[PDB]
Design a protein around this ligand. Structure first.
Ligand SMILES: [Ca+2]
Lengths: 6, 95
């Protein structure tokens, strides 16, 4: 939970 | 100096405050779309956000959303984006 593209 | 400038962080603070900041933070939900509007793939936003996520908590505060603004605008008319947070673009609050 931290990158909206991973 | 700071990879970002005063006039660039000014437009970054308008995009950051255009999503409705919370206590000084933007959630990937507000940035993700902000990075998807650069016509760039999730590979640039996946890297522009990480190097932009100074706290890495799924959010981008005014200072974090700024590092990801030039990383997005410079990925369109400047160059590719690496995955190494450069020391000339990190706030002293993270260290
Ligand atoms: Ca953060």
């Amino acid at each position: 939970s931290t990158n909206p593209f991973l | 100096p700071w990879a970002v400038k005063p006039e660039d962080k000014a437009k970054y603070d308008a995009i950051f405050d255009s999503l409705s900041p919370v206590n000084g933070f933007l959630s990937g939900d507000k940035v993700k779309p902000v990075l998807l509007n650069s016509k760039l793939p999730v590979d640039i936003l996946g890297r522009v956000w990480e190097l932009s996520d100074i706290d890495h908590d799924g959010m981008l505060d005014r200072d974090e959303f700024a590092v990801a603004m030039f990383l997005v605008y410079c990925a369109l008319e400047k160059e590719p984006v690496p995955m190494s947070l450069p020391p000339a673009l990190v706030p002293p609050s993270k260290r």
